[PDB]
């Protein structure tokens, strides 16, 4: 009856009907100050990144084994892993269907490069966590550029095809990608819904700092390894991170990162919409 | 990229390193009697189907909640579900990268149409099983054309882009697509025992029994248990034999094999392909 | 030593000792305002409804697979299923022994029809739940008249055999039977916690959400799990509320409460019975 | 439609489609040699005793916790416990509806007296097994008469209401009730579905003899307590009963009961159809 | 190079936690009579600190404590295998150090006292795990082994190097009792609160209450639950107060303080030592 | 003195179970050279039985074992707090006995060895619980501590009372390795594969981890601590394909040969060689 399209996407629409997710759209419209894409073409870019992003979120909640998203049951907690995995993979390819409409020969070439960049990120993020091998500050920064720069580059990259603007923004995109992950990492451990990263066992920016700062100690890995829901251990864990100064080390990097963005944002000629956003996200750093 | 790639594909390489499962290539390789694609470009096409097909198995073992493949632990049984999903997702896009080498404008268009058909099939297959809604013979045949015909069509379609053979083979592909599924469906319940009865899947024979005896709910209630108990599996098969679903499945397969030869003959005759059907048909 | 009677009824006497709300007895004693039964025959009849009722509770706590009843461990959690099933089945026939004392030619004929009606109720309730086929609002209401109407109809029916009151009470009985089940359905999902979602049964609030939102399958997927998980359980209650199933239940109850008063007036009025309806209804207002 | 009856009766119909011995029917037709009931009422009684009997098996499979009946999966292994428990309780009352027929005042009274008798039987059998207290031979014989004599009494009891035959059959029924149960006890331990009574943990006639014959020993109770599915343990259990002579004791008891049956059958005037049936069952211990 | 650090990482964790060095304050005050050389005394104090701290690691598994001094328990972070082994290593590290004394009898004494120490803790565990409460005399008697063990070892070893020949065994016992009975009172008289009731151990107040009401079974029923539930614990203190166990403990604490002063006088007087008791004695009143 | 009953209950439980006291057989066998006085030898033999069995109570808690010598573990019956304390008690009961030797060096020697032993069990635990695998070199070196602790202690004490003055430490170390690696091989080859569920690093698993570095399959199966037979069955198959079982055997034969050569240099000991010949029949 062709309603099959409806049935398959209930898990996908479930995540959309959930609150939040404001940032993805703001960057695409804020970067448009330079790129200035046509309203017709721009709508395509926004719609596709919205799809890909949410689709990746369905997968990431299984990979992280998250129990709650935006305060609601994870999609697969209601529909089950088979239905969620398939629905997300379907959304992926629905995106490629839309990208082909861009009508640009290079849309497919760029779409492939960025998705592979993204999956190598989530691939490393999983390899380190699931093989209990801690990454250095150096590697972590590098895979984050893949993981979160993947969806950024796709949106700004696609826009670049239709713009007469030829100067390169890859440096600003990188700095923003890091600013986002490290901010989300910092907020995750600082302010139910308490230290969600400690239960998932992931290596966040502060936990990575504590692990190398105290080589003689083996406490942070033994707590991360437990994937504990126990608050008292988490409470102690946050205390330790404060004692070793891991929160102080992150802020100074964020403040350091924040500077590069303004310096880089000014050098491209300025975008008032974008500066307002950085000042905003940074108030909690 | 700098060996980052090795780590990511360990689960994928595990499934290849496992014995068997070489048929997908044999059918595509036999069709080259008609299509006659270039050897260089064809290696690209054959390589992609191996990648996509094997990658698709990594996912199907998570969906079917299968334990063990070809007598070995399921991929995620060793590496864990997060690691397996990403490697399989990674291989897909690695495939698309490979297709782009074809340099043919329409290769990407075809890759999309077929991959979407493949997911709707697997989607229906999952929806029915996990929402406990049994499909009719019409839908089941129809989803098999999507589910298993999807990756077939991808390979034959890509070959057809480079082939002078202009006559249409799509009717044979569907007829063949069904022949696989109904045979594997029959062999699974008729001969590590009754893997379909434990997974709770709707196979061709169980679908017949459910509709032949409307007053009964025995097969619906046994599939629902996802039972490993042998007595139920042993009884379940006995019931299917008494209700005549095995005769109906057999008669369908024998009918299907016939249509294939007739369709093969209108294409001018193909010795390599006919031998394979004769081979697969020995199961009944 | 003829002490065998003790052993046989030990699971039954256990459940009887637990405190309860004698809702059935109260309704029966209130209908005597019209029926005006002799005290002796009424004493026999009331004793029979108590036995039959409790016997069915022992059986239903196995079927609805309850963890506890009236806040205490379930009967079979202590004595084991074989002993309880036999104890309950035994009490049934002890009832038939008691009914024969009534001496009325039709007493047995009525007792058979009512038990045959009752089992079709508990039977359909199980058929739907265990074959995962949801009933329509119409189908549900009809089985409720059988399931809970069974002991009501039996108690008032036996009373009428000895009464000069000839006017018809079946409509009031139906209106009340629905009032009780649908109230219990609402109270369970609206106030350890939410036992109906874990047993997987279809109650009136869940049934409304299933037909009101046909595109969705969240309520069937949450019911299917038979989850003791609170986060999913809490989410489900929220979903039922947003879709308005709780409002629809309330408005349905109010329709019945009205019909009950109107029907009571047509039968000449009953202060004890109206007081009881006014009372139970204070909980959904 | 009113076809709900089908849906509610699916587990009951599953048990009927299975092969059996029809022995419940075979005696009823044989006892009719004296009673000579009209075909109309006899067909009703035959319908009722079949229902009650089969319904009780669905329940007996749950209480005994059996995992196989006549070689097929038990009723509740396929349909689930709730669906079977309700279906079984239903057939009971469907029976009472049917018994209401015959237009006899005493038919219901007899139906109750007997059904109450049967439940007191199954109750003792459960109390002993679940409280691990083995009954004495005298006690065991007594509850078996309730357990299986309960439903015998119902079929032959109802027939007598409509028969001019006034002579007494309770002594013959008792002797026959014992012969059946003690025969099933012997056959079960003497032949998948191997030695099913040992895993269910039941007290059989042979197992009860060994328990009292060797008081110092605690072996038969330790095997019953495990409820083992292990064949090797059961094979040993069979051996012990043989060394202690429980199987010999059962045979001599069966041989005596068979004899009492012939003498009692003759005292009622002789029954050619019935003796053929008894002579047949006796080949299993001779 | 040397794996000694890895093996003792749990032990170093426990040292870093805040605790009153009660053992060192008393042991160092007794030197007023013994007049031990600074060289030998430094070693003696070092061993007793080691043994005590290791003993706390083991007692945290045996007592099954949740946390200590407000921090996660030692094995709560490193796991039982790592902690138990790390602790036993510290034991033998003590034996190595005792051998440094160069005095022949140190090892004989170190064995006698360590064996006495384990015989105490053996009884303490057995009574608690068999749900059998000991008599007050039995409790006092094992306390002298369990906690008297390290006093005697610290004072005993010092005496090998002291010319003071008079007997200090009576005073040492008086203090050993004074401490344990003080900790017992403080635990129930008052952030982790009444940890002793959840661990289920027999303290001096509960031992009084259990025998004072022989007909009573209330304190045993709370001890068996090993509950973290606060309402039970708050009630439990209330019962002990009505039965007068807190008055009894105080009167005993007040009496021992007296016995200490009288006994300290016979040893000629020690200002540092008496000052300490006056201080610790402030806990009642 | 009745407390001694309560305190020694888990110790006595473990002592009562039948096992071939292999440690004791050597201690009695090395006496062919040492020729200790009968009175002093009885004490030394007595001390090793306590220390050995006492430590077994503790290792059953650390290795999270479920069975020891085929019976329930001590703490399964008496509870871990009660068992841990009883074991700690036996140690000091051991220390008490050594003093009866009346020899000045007994305690110095007893301390050195117990410290060596705990560094072993400590390293063994650090690796398993912090998920870092040791090299063959590291593994060999710590094993000499773990099992070499009591050998060195028993033979060391005898030599204090013995006229044999020449050096046996090289032979002792060679024997220490041979035992552990034998028990390691036997554990994964012939109540099934207890070493895989405990997650410990044994000699064969250690070889597979370094021989195939690009692979991470054995580390992921050890991490799971799975009781699953299918995963364990596969793991033995994998260890076999990489030849870790061949490398272990060749190592054992390498050790067996060194053992005979070292005994020959000491002048010969018939009791000892028969013992190695017997234990070595295990890989042939």
UniProtKB/Swiss-Prot annotation, chain C:
GO terms for cellular component: cytoplasm; cytosol; nucleoplasm; perinuclear region of cytoplasm; Z disc. Its cofactor is Mg(2+). Abundantly expressed in testis. Found in other tissues to a lower extent. Expressed in dermal fibroblast and skeletal muscle. Keywords: Acetylation, Congenital muscular dystrophy, Cytoplasm, Deafness, Disease variant, Isoprene biosynthesis, Lipid metabolism, Magnesium, Metal-binding, Transferase. Subject to product inhibition by geranylgeranyl diphosphate. Mg(2+) 2 binds at residues 60, 64. Its EC number is 2.5.1.-, 2.5.1.1, 2.5.1.29, 2.5.1.10. It catalyses: isopentenyl diphosphate + dimethylallyl diphosphate = (2E)-geranyl diphosphate + diphosphate; isopentenyl diphosphate + (2E)-geranyl diphosphate = (2E,6E)-farnesyl diphosphate + diphosphate; isopentenyl diphosphate + (2E,6E)-farnesyl diphosphate = (2E,6E,10E)-geranylgeranyl diphosphate + diphosphate. Pathway: Isoprenoid biosynthesis; farnesyl diphosphate biosynthesis; farnesyl diphosphate from geranyl diphosphate and isopentenyl diphosphate: step 1/1; Isoprenoid biosynthesis; geranyl diphosphate biosynthesis; geranyl diphosphate from dimethylallyl diphosphate and isopentenyl diphosphate: step 1/1; Isoprenoid biosynthesis; geranylgeranyl diphosphate biosynthesis; geranylgeranyl diphosphate from farnesyl diphosphate and isopentenyl diphosphate: step 1/1. It is an enzyme of class 2 (transferase). It comes from the Eukaryota. One of its GO terms (molecular function) is dimethylallyltranstransferase activity. Mg(2+) 1 binds at residues 60, 64. Isopentenyl diphosphate binds at residues 21, 24, 53, 70. Dimethylallyl diphosphate binds at residues 69, 147-148, 181, 201. Changing residue 250 to G: In MDHLO; shows slightly decreased farnesyltranstransferase activity. Binds 3 Mg(2+) ions. GO terms for biological process: farnesyl diphosphate biosynthetic process; geranyl diphosphate biosynthetic process; geranylgeranyl diphosphate biosynthetic process; isoprenoid biosynthetic process; isoprenoid metabolic process. It is found in: Cytoplasm; Cytoplasm, Perinuclear region; Cytoplasm, Myofibril, Sarcomere, Z line. The keyword Cytoplasm applies. Belongs to the FPP/GGPP synthase family. Catalyzes the trans-addition of the three molecules of IPP onto DMAPP to form geranylgeranyl pyrophosphate, an important precursor of carotenoids and geranylated proteins. It is linked to Muscular dystrophy, congenital hearing loss, and ovarian insufficiency syndrome: An autosomal recessive disorder characterized by early-onset progressive muscle weakness, sensorineural hearing loss, and primary amenorrhea due to ovarian insufficiency. Some patients become wheelchair-bound by the second decade, whereas others have a milder phenotype and maintain independent ambulation into adulthood. Most patients have respiratory insufficiency. Homohexamer; trimer of homodimers. This is Geranylgeranyl pyrophosphate synthase. The gene is GGPS1.
